[PDB]
Amino acid sequence: HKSEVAHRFKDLGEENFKALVLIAFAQYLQQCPFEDHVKLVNEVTEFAKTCVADESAENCDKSLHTLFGDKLCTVATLRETYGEMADCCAKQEPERNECFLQHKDDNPNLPRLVRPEVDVMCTAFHDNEETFLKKYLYEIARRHPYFYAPELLFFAKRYKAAFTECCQAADKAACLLPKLDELRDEGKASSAKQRLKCASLQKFGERAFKAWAVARLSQRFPKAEFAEVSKLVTDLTKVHTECCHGDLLECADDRADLAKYICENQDSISSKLKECCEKPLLEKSHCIAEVENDEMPADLPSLAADFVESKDVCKNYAEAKDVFLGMFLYEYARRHPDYSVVLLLRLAKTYETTLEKCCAAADPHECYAKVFDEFKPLVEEPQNLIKQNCELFEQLGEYKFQNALLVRYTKKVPQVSTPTLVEVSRNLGKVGSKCCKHPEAKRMPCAEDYLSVVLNQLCVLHEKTPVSDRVTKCCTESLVNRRPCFSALEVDETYVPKEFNAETFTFHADICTLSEKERQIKKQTALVELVKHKPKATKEQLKAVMDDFAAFVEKCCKADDKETCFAEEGKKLVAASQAALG
Ligand SMILES: CCCCCCCC(=O)O
Ligand SMILES: CCCCCCCC(=O)O
Ligand SMILES: CCCCCCCC(=O)O
């Protein structure tokens, strides 16, 4: 009451409050030293403590955003570090906070993290334990500005547990790396997923996220009722709206209340929440988010009875045009848990479009009667793409699959920057190994729900510097139809070739000197540059010359002595390739 900061301090705590203010400061001022953030966080914590001590103290009844802005832009006084943000500290709410959000750079130019030796790491661990963790939050926060803040509190706890367990024992080295590598890969997949849920709210509206929540939650919690699912959807969309416009303190407090509410009414929602509701406070929210699908209730009546075979559908749509679509998306999703939540959204849009021209054109019950018959092509389009691409996967392997995708997507949009083309085709090829092990029933909810994440990275790294017109149209036209837009483009007849640059195909030394995971990029980028050299005369057997590149390495990889072999076979290879016209 009368003080939001005091209420947040009382609710969250003292250790969860200082952590959430370090994340908020680091996600806004990405290029700032650690000590500055520590000082600001300490000052904010002291101010909050004083406001808790006396509610009618010096001014602290102001909204959290106002205090954030006052400590952020009126105190930092660094304009050469962040250009044009000096003019940002000139407006009022809600203009200043909106201004701050466009400057969160998704791909900052910061040095890549290098992991020190285990001995030094655990030596520094048992000296300033309270600071060693605070450095972990700072780096992950600044490199991933849209990371899910209450989730990042969980990763810090797992990091601390991992350090406490292993190197306070024998075999310090080969205990930590197998565990820390699990968090690094799990931390780069929960940041791309949250970016998608957060770019669907500030670009496509709250009506787009609410439908996604209704479709997703109804799959995972059947045998519930629309009254319960609507409440859960409203609470969830309130939670996820606050983690996007920087209200981390209010986002972490609302998530805990939602988890508590779900655990209280466990029986009315799902029968698989017994285990997740007996965990600590930070682990309940993670367990509930990844709970498995509940068993479908038996004896569900066919959906055609009261959606196409009832003489009130037009009246029901006229009465309210979003609660009827909510019911259709809820009923068609609880009984189809083998569909991706983006395919279900597409069918709901098709039903709405059919009803729009049928509830206001002559006889209603003559044109929407066969609406369910036109759902078949939409259903069969992605399952014929998963069955084919995943068949291509288990005859080439991961590395050779990423190359096939790389050539396919370079000819579709031969104007995106090479680092983006390489980095998005490497992520696309990892869906072929992530869930091709699943049976056919579980393939679609995993593949198409992962591709939608990856393609999002192609759009948020392209909004900053729009170069290709096709990518702009596919990204900014519809959220659900973003994947069918991409997998429908033929080879671009425009984009006259890039001409010949000799220095690109001039591999000099190295290569067989560093890790396999990183030396692969230095060859995939060469392949990308090769494709953009001849977009049109690029028939499949021509890229067998790609194998020759490997050969050009192989010999010199074992003949590293007389390193001039790199140049010799390089000029030989480029002469032979140019003589081959492809
Ligand atoms: C407290 C965690 C909230 C879980 C409800 C649904 C989560 C999701 O589907 O993302
Ligand atoms: C692309 C959105 C399709 C579903 C519209 C209704 C959403 C809701 O239930 O609020
Ligand atoms: C099993 C993975 C299937 C999809 C791979 C990527 C298809 C595409 O977007 O062209």
From Swiss-Prot:
SMART domains the record matches: ALBUMIN (SM00103)
Residues recorded with modification Phosphothreonine: T81, T418, T420
UniProt-annotated binding residues for Cu cation: H1
Keywords tagged on the record: Calcium, Cleavage on pair of basic residues, Copper, Disease variant, Disulfide bond, Glycation, Glycoprotein, Lipid-binding, Metal-binding, Methylation, Phosphoprotein, Repeat, Secreted, Signal, Zinc
GO terms of biological process kind: cellular response to calcium ion starvation; cellular response to starvation; negative regulation of mitochondrial depolarization
GO CC annotation: blood microparticle; cytoplasm; endoplasmic reticulum; endoplasmic reticulum lumen; extracellular exosome; extracellular region; extracellular space; Golgi apparatus
InterPro entries per the UniProt record, alphabetical: ALB/AFP/VDB, Serum_albumin-like, Serum_albumin/AFP/Afamin, Serum_albumin_CS, Serum_albumin_N
UniProt effect for mutating D267G: In Nagasaki-1
Modified residues (N6-succinyllysine): K203, K434, K517, K562
Disulfide bonds: C51-C60, C73-C89, C88-C99, C122-C167, C166-C175, C198-C244, C243-C251, C263-C277, C276-C287, C314-C359, C358-C367, C390-C436, C435-C446, C459-C475, C474-C485, C512-C557, C556-C565
Modified sites of kind N6-methyllysine: K532
UniProt: Ca(2+) 2 binding residues: D11, D253, D257
Tissues showing expression: Plasma.
UniProt site (Not glycated): 2, 18, 39, 62, 71, 91, 104, 134, 157, 172, 179, 188, 193, 203, 210, 238, 260, 272, 284, 357, 370, 387, 400, 412, 430, 434, 464, 473, 498, 517, 522, 536, 539, 555, 558, 562, 572
Record site: Aspirin-acetylated lysine: K197
Phenotype when changing E380K: In Hiroshima-2
Glycosylated residue positions: 10, 49, 135, 160, 197, 223, 231, 274, 279, 311, 315-316, 321, 349, 376, 411, 437, 442, 492, 523, 532, 534, 543, 571
Substitution effect: E352K: In Hiroshima-1
Role of this protein: Binds water, Ca(2+), Na(+), K(+), fatty acids, hormones, bilirubin and drugs. Its main function is the regulation of the colloidal osmotic pressure of blood. Major zinc transporter in plasma, typically binds about 80% of all plasma zinc. Major calcium and magnesium transporter in plasma, binds approximately 45% of circulating calcium and magnesium in plasma. Potentially has more than two calcium-binding sites and might additionally bind calcium in a non-specific manner.
Similarity field: Belongs to the ALB/AFP/VDB family.
Oligomeric form and interacting partners: Interacts with FCGRT; this interaction regulates ALB homeostasis. Interacts with TASOR. In plasma, occurs in a covalently-linked complex with chromophore-bound alpha-1-microglobulin with molar ratio 1:2 and 1:1; this interaction does not prevent fatty acid binding to ALB.
Associated disorder: Hyperthyroxinemia, familial dysalbuminemic: A disorder characterized by abnormally elevated levels of total serum thyroxine (T4) in euthyroid patients. It is due to abnormal serum albumin that binds T4 with enhanced affinity.
Protein name per Swiss-Prot or TrEMBL: Albumin
Originating organism: Homo sapiens (Human)
